[PDB]
Amino acid sequence: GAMAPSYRVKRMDIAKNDEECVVNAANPRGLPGDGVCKAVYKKWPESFKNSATPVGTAKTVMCGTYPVIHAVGPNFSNYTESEGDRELAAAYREVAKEVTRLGVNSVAIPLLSTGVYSGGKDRLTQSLNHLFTAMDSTDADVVIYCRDKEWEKKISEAIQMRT
Ligand SMILES: [Cl-]
Ligand SMILES: [Cl-]
Ligand SMILES: [Cl-]
């Protein structure tokens, strides 16, 4: 575990992370996809061997010795608000199990279901709170990656406000 487990946020490409493992915002079929999933495919393509996994689950595949945890958030275009919320909470609980199993001291994580799976809604607070519910009991250093300047400020404020 990390000596003083922390949350941090960075505004940059998660493909350039400085952590011991990465969470992919995957699709259920293990396809290259778009956004975070596409950048992960370009950086760790070997990790997409047998990566297909259902909504609300996480599956780790090693790229050399570097773990890629494929976490499948719901597409809120397809799910009701209620069922989507349950599956989004579940995907993050499976991330916490994988991070613990791997024994890593740090993990890079995107906000699941906030991009093209958001069903056109702002889900920063919803996705972040489910991330916290899952990861709070882990002792890894968590580094959240985002691309938008106003999302970086809002994530940073939510972190510091618990400290
Ligand atoms: Cl960048
Ligand atoms: Cl997404
Ligand atoms: Cl973002």
Curated annotation (Swiss-Prot):
Q: Where does ADP-D-ribose bind?
A: 13, 27, 35, 115-117
Residue ranges of every copy of the Macro domain listed in the record: 4-163
User: Which top-rank group of organisms is this from?
Assistant: Viruses
Where does it localize?
A: Host cytoplasmic vesicle membrane
* Resulting phenotype, residue 27 to R/Y: Almost complete loss of mono-ADP-ribosylhydrolase activity
The UniProt PTM text for this protein says: Phosphorylated by host on serines and threonines.
Give the consequence of mutating residue 36 to E/F: Almost complete loss of mono-ADP-ribosylhydrolase activity
Instruction: Specify the effect of residue 13 to A.
Output: Partial loss of ADP-ribose 1'' phosphate phosphatase activity
Membrane topology term reads:
Peripheral membrane protein
What the protein does?
A: Seems to be essential for minus-strand RNAs and subgenomic 26S mRNAs synthesis. Displays mono-ADP-ribosylhydrolase activity. ADP-ribosylation is a post-translational modification that controls various processes of the host cell and the virus probably needs to revert it for optimal viral replication. Binds proteins of G3BP family and sequesters them into the viral RNA replication complexes thereby inhibiting the formation of host stress granules on viral mRNAs.
Relate the assembly described in the record. Interacts with mRNA-capping enzyme nsP1. Interacts (via C-terminus) with host G3BP1; this interaction inhibits the formation of host stress granules on viral mRNAs and the nsp3-G3BP1 complexes bind viral RNAs and probably orchestrate the assembly of viral replication complexes. Interacts (via C-terminus) with host G3BP2; this interaction inhibits the formation of host stress granules on viral mRNAs and the nsp3-G3BP2 complexes bind viral RNAs and probably orchestrate the assembly of viral replication complexes. Interacts (via C-terminus) with host NAP1L1.
Domains as described in the record:
In the N-terminus, the macro domain displays a mono-ADP-ribosylhydrolase activity. The central part called, the alphavirus unique domain (AUD) has a zinc-binding function. The C-terminus region, also called hypervariable domain (HVD), is mainly disordered and binds several host proteins. This intrinsically disordered domain contains 2 SH3 domain-binding sites and 2 FGDF motifs necessary and sufficient for the formation of nsP3/G3BP complexes.
Name of the molecule in the record: Non-structural protein 3
Q: What is the lineage of its organism?
A: Viruses, Riboviria, Orthornavirae, Kitrinoviricota, Alsuviricetes
